[PDB]
Homo-oligomer: 155 residues x 6
């Protein structure tokens, strides 16, 4: 039984995230999306989880959970030791590499990186929110349910 964790704040989840989720779910027996919260954003943890579940309805081996603290503890507590992280334009890859090597050192957890599809490579949660805030149309970059909710939080 294989498995990996897909971590992020997902505030909100984007089609870039979904693409990575789909690829993880296709290649591992079990995937857990870890909605990591800070001491703070647009959507509550519960809202974020609901948006991810709506978007991943077709992935029966993927589940969504909230987490706090050390990512490697979240991973190991669930009997796993792999992380799958997406890459997009603007990803701080050098910092991701630093964290991957740190996470392997402190807990033996591996990190696999996968680039999101070119079509979704320039969306990020932060930039989608910024563009939407000023009336820009990011509907092609987000799940339909997310775009609906986003307009709600803004209007």
């Amino acid at each position: 039984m294989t498995g990996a964790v897909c971590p992020g704040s997902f505030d909100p989840v984007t089609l870039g995230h979904l693409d990575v989720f789909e690829r993880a779910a296709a290649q591992f027996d079990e995937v857990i999306v870890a909605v990591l919260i800070n001491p703070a954003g647009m959507f509550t943890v519960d809202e974020r989880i609901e948006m991810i579940r709506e978007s991943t309805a077709d992935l029966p081996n993927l589940r969504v959970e909230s987490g706090q603290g050390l990512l490697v503890d979240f991973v190991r507590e669930r009997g796993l030791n792999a992380i799958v992280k997406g890459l997009r334009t603007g990803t701080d890859f050098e910092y991701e590499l630093q964290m991957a090597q740190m996470n392997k050192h402190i807990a033996g957890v591996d990190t696999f990186f996968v680039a999101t599809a070119p079509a979704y490579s320039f969306v990020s949660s932060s930039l989608a929110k910024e563009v939407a805030t000023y009336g820009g149309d990011v509907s092609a970059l987000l799940p339909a349910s997310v775009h609906q909710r986003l307009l709600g939080k803004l209007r």
Copy 2:
């Protein structure tokens, strides 16, 4: 009827910026420098605009305006669809690429990048202010007008 917008916070404008303005003005019929308002910074919007106008008096086809909201709206509301953005040492080019792809997606606006001259490649508004704050000589890196104004804000 060609034209481009050169965006930035310009707090203050540097010779690195001016070099890019000059190239934009040499290659496009019309250039608009967009002083993006959203942090208070050191100089007020009017001061920034004044300093740019003073530094670009020899560029007849260049004008300076402030703007709020999406950069692409600023560009499109003036009948243009090109941005000219400078590169220097320390530019977050990956983030600029993300924004360029987003801006093309949401509004059909092209972004052209040009590297500033080597002599001005290590100045930024932030680093110039920091160095000058602590008594370093940045007079070779700023328009003569700007430099005096900066000393004024500090003393």
Copy 3:
């Protein structure tokens, strides 16, 4: 009286190149595609030129010429002093920056960089030829005319 030169070996021209040509032609009055002759490659200079002309028939202000020697001489001998160069995934941008600074130094020619559309961001002439050689379908990544011609050279 604005103008830019779009240089490359174009062996063959891709949709990534065409996207850049289209943007250059939309933002400058005059565009010259420079097919730089110096390795024999797959297609002859005349074939490359033909394929570009066929692919750019809807761009009235664009023309195609071959060139030898310094790119800056090609540009300056046509009364221009701007280069428009595309960026894709795998572009050696650091080398392009070195050449841009050198070209500005020796001839006062500016270089503007523009990222090609995400959909065409992973095609290159080399990778398209390699993949097609081994039977991969690159028809979505090349002008329809070019694609048939490529199949011809292979079969």
Copy 4:
């Protein structure tokens, strides 16, 4: 029935490669090491030598096997009923080229590429730099598995 292909020329395999093999084998049900051969440029080691050196240093990995191939990697992957590649990263990896290839490979064949950074201890070895250093007498013994080191010295002498 999960699985991935770990590709390379492995001329010779290094401890950097082996680290990546081990991680892939720990995270996928089956792993195939694809020894990709250019039929028009011989390397230092023959295909059989390359395969033997990998097998001898992966004997502890029961779910890993080693096969050679040529042409499109995605055909090698798909003909084995898989659609994942696991590729290692080290210092000096042309990551932008690997990203270009990954996006191309997804486009033409639907195959996903997962990248994993090799351990810091092995992050500066590559087949090419190991061969170069050894050619001029440098000690690369700590960077290559035992199945490789003296065979490499043999080729050079």
Copy 5:
């Protein structure tokens, strides 16, 4: 009478920093570790604590001394009759910003900056990531000198 300044906030010093200190001390007649303080943002450790942790882990380096400062690094360097900075590189270093600062520092004061990559074993530690990991219970004991680790745990508790 050669010499270099090794700058940082060292809040706390890591084994990555110490590796760089050791290399600088091996290659220059004198080394000064400059503990640069922002007078308007306190860190986890006080200046005296930072200096004590560095001193305790550099006792074997007779030609290294430790001093705090603020403001322009190049003034700290020049007022000591030196004109070289030795700065470490690790994974996640903002090298482009360091390059910008190096060119600025040469321009305004004639001071040269030499960069050296820390050892692979210490390449993924940083003061900030060590503090973050330790805050949430992760084991960073192998990445920090003995002068630091339990003091860090003390601050966090």
Copy 6:
């Protein structure tokens, strides 16, 4: 007694190289420029050494020697264990980092990197030769004696 080696092929030496030499000579008691030859260029080893000696006449603690084989052997044979390498626009820094870590591992030799001055940041031996070959003026980027010799080898 401190010391470092500055390695390269220097075919020919540029002002970028000279800037690095000067900084090494200012910071180390002894500097050795290692002219490394391959199994191949424009100038012979002896010509390269002569051009470097002409350019470094004012550096009494710097000497020039040819070398073959492992750079770390060259360094250690001379009682040293430091390398000083310059950085310019277009340097393959990731490969330099790989070699530095390899060189430290196999022989305990440290590598210090220093960026050349912005004015000399876009010259390289290869690009200077290429530009000069087609009649471009690189005289501001090379020592006077070198530029003289370069015109000689070309004409």
